[PDB]
Amino acid sequence: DIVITQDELSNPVTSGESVSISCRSSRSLLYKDGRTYLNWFLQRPGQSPQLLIYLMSTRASGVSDRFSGSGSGTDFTLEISRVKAEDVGVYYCQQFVEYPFTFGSGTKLEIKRADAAPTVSIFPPSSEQLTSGGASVVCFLNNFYPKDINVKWKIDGSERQNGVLNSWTDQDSKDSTYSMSSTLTLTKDEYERHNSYTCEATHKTSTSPIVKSFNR
Amino acid sequence: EVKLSESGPGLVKPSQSLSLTCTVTGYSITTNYAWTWIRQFPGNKLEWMGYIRSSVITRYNPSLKSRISITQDTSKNQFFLQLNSVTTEDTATYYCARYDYYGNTGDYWGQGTSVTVSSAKTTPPSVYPLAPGTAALKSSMVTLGCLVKGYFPEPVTVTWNSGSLSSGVHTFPAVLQSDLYTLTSSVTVPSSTWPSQTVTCNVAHPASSTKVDKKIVPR
Ligand SMILES: [Zn+2]
Ligand SMILES: [Zn+2]
Ligand SMILES: [Zn+2]
Ligand SMILES: [Zn+2]
Numbered sequence: 001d002i003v004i005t006q007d008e009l010s011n012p013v014t015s016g017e018s019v020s021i022s023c024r025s026s027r028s029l030l031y032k033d034g035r036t037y038l039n040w041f042l043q044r045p046g047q048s049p050q051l052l053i054y055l056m057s058t059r060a061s062g063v064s065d066r067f068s069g070s071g072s073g074t075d076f077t078l079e080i081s082r083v084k085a086e087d088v089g090v091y092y093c094q095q096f097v098e099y100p101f102t103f104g105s106g107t108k109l110e111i112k113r114a115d116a117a118p119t120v121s122i123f124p125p126s127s128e129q130l131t132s133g134g135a136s137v138v139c140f141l142n143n144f145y146p147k148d149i150n151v152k153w154k155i156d157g158s159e160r161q162n163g164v165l166n167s168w169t170d171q172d173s174k175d176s177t178y179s180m181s182s183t184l185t186l187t188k189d190e191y192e193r194h195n196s197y198t199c200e201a202t203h204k205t206s207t208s209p210i211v212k213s214f215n216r
Numbered sequence: 217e218v219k220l221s222e223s224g225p226g227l228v229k230p231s232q233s234l235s236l237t238c239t240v241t242g243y244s245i246t247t248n249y250a251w252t253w254i255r256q257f258p259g260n261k262l263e264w265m266g267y268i269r270s271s272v273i274t275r276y277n278p279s280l281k282s283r284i285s286i287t288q289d290t291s292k293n294q295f296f297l298q299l300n301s302v303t304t305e306d307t308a309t310y311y312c313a314r315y316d317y318y319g320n321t322g323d324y325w326g327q328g329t330s331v332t333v334s335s336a337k338t339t340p341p342s343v344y345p346l347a348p349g350t351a352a353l354k355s356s357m358v359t360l361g362c363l364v365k366g367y368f369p370e371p372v373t374v375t376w377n378s379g380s381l382s383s384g385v386h387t388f389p390a391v392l393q394s395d396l397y398t399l400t401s402s403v404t405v406p407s408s409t410w411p412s413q414t415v416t417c418n419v420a421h422p423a424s425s426t427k428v429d430k431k432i433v434p435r
Contacts, residue, residue, distance in 0.1 A: 035318070138346055
């Protein structure tokens with residue numbers, strides 16, 4: 001029955017800056033023993049949640065002192081001192097007073113850093129895939145910032161939008177950059193009908209797009 | 217040290233029963249700790265499911281009605297989760313953890329195990345090498361990759377050179393289409409390491425008990 005609220009995202013924080021994450025409960029979490037039962041977790045992409053703080057302000061074993069918790073009974077805050085690239089992820093609070101031990105919706109920490117142009121690489125279908133009657137052309141756009149980016153596919157000079165699937169990674173824990181994969185899937189017959197395949201990337205870091213291509 | 221590890225089928229048909237196991241090593245589950253199950257839905261919402269403590273005491277989330285059951289096998293130091301009459305809404309990543317009375321779990325969390333509730337069939341992936349067409353900027357870096365296409369359900373694990381090659385690796389989230397997932401992984405290394413040194417992507421798909429090792433060879 002207890003509902004906990006948290007902001008989806010935080011303003012981008014620069015490495016070195018400190019930030020406070022908020023969490024509010026619909027009911028007091030202070031117990032008759034004087035202790036407040038609130039937990040703070042950090043979860044990185046593909047990683048299991050990691051406990052940072054329990055009992056509202058007690059740091060868990062091995063947890064960096066840069067992490068501290070405070071609050072009343074309905075409003076809690078997690079302060080992260082001198083933020084580092086490694087702290088990127090989603091922060092969740094969990095009330096541990098009454099069942100069910102509901103979790104907050106999580107607040108994603110977004111790191112801010114210098115703009116970076118993507119490294120673009122284009123790959124023709126492999127001979128193995130062509131034997132299947134399918135043909136995927138792949139383009140990697142790695143290590144760029146900000147996350148906003150546009151990719152265009154051109155076959156023999158003409159833009160192709162159908163059959164394109166993109167995938168973005170979460171913010172990197174080491175350099176705070178983003179990466180994206182774009183795949184243009186065609187039938188082998190169609191792939192065999194054209195010669196020039198081009199991947200064009202348009203990013204904030206430049207007026208002119210980054211072009212990568214190959215001839216079949 | 218104390219470790220928890222979840223195991224169980226990654227795909228279950230709707231209306232059927234879901235059974236998972238958490239094997240605990242380094243600590244006895246006959247203790248008075250809340251050996252609990254928590255799940256995370258696509259979208260990242262977390263939900264506490266229930267726990268078993270002191271071998272015979274349990275507590276479940278009311279939202280799970282009467283379809284959840286948590287039990288244990290003391291002799292094997294394992295505790296279990298059984299969820300009946302599943303629907304696509306039970307698709308999630310299931311985690312086991314050890315909570316103490318104060319809410320402290322320490323680092324006692326499993327790695328999580330993905331469970332998909334779907335009528336679709338299990339399909340192993342086809343793994344294709346991604347090698348550069350020609351010769352890009354020399355004396356610098358070169359990006360290679362592997363395309364893991366047409367599998368179901370999630371997930372697949374991808375490593376390079378059996379794990380000895382981890383830096384400069386980007387494995388992208390899979391994209392679903394026609395009940396089949398496709399994912400890609402890129403790896404960037406010095407133009408001096410490849411093709412001089414062998415670079416191989418290792419792909420595993422637990423659901424189909426399949427493993428593929430694709431060496432990346434020059435065009
Ligand atoms: Zn990276
Ligand atoms: Zn055509
Ligand atoms: Zn041990
Ligand atoms: Zn037994």
